[PDB]
Write a protein that binds this ligand. Structure first.
Ligand SMILES: *[C@@H]1O[C@H](CO)[C@@H](O)[C@H](O)[C@H]1NC(C)=O
Ligand SMILES: *[C@@H]1O[C@H](CO)[C@@H](O)[C@H](O)[C@H]1NC(C)=O
Lengths: 88, 24, 48
């Protein structure tokens, strides 16, 4: 397994995507995963390591462009909504 | 501002208001 | 003038007291937050 890179994971059949982080969430030795609401599998314990991880889906947002018009120019900006300036 | 009790999952979002509160 | 200024100054004082003490003083603003957030909740529950 890897961490902090959003991967097409497959833990025991649970097929998804997202970044995996170490968990502080107190599992119990008979708990396999957690879902906060709406079947959102939020955490999961790997089958081999027995280590619990959190799953946050890798960042996404809308992209909206800022144009001055067409007859005025063709130069534009681009806004990556609610994304930290670390991705493309 | 203390007497009120004002998170995104999938497709949901909350665009921020244009006029910030310290402008309002 | 002097008394009138006192009534006005005093009346303003009771406002924050009536606002701070009595909860449910902002019933109107709280609904528009409650409803509009309750409605979002049902939208997500429907994914399950
Ligand atoms: C699986 O079992 C083998 C045999 O003992 C062991 O070498 C390996 O480390 C085990 N895997 C894990 C993740 O512990
Ligand atoms: C973005 O990432 C940087 C570096 O990790 C961090 O300092 C900052 O708090 C993050 N969030 C924002 C809104 O800049």
């Amino acid at each position: 397994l890897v961490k902090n890179k959003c991967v097409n994971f497959n833990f025991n059949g649970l097929t998804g995507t997202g970044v995996l982080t170490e968990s502080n969430k107190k599992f119990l030795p008979f708990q396999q995963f957690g879902r906060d609401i709406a079947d959102t599998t939020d955490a999961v314990r790997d089958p081999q390591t027995l280590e619990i991880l959190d799953i946050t889906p890798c960042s996404f947002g809308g992209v909206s462009v800022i144009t001055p018009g067409t007859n005025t120019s063709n130069q534009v900006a681009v806004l990556y909504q609610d994304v930290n300036c670390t991705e493309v | 501002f203390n007497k009120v009790t004002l998170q995104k999952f999938n497709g949901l979002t909350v665009l921020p208001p244009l006029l910030t509160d310290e402008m309002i | 003038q002097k008394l009138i200024a006192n009534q006005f100054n005093s009346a303003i004082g009771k406002i924050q007291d009536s606002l701070s003490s009595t909860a449910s003083a902002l019933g109107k603003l709280q609904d528009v937050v409650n409803q509009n957030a309750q409605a979002l909740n049902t939208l997500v529950k429907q994914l399950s």
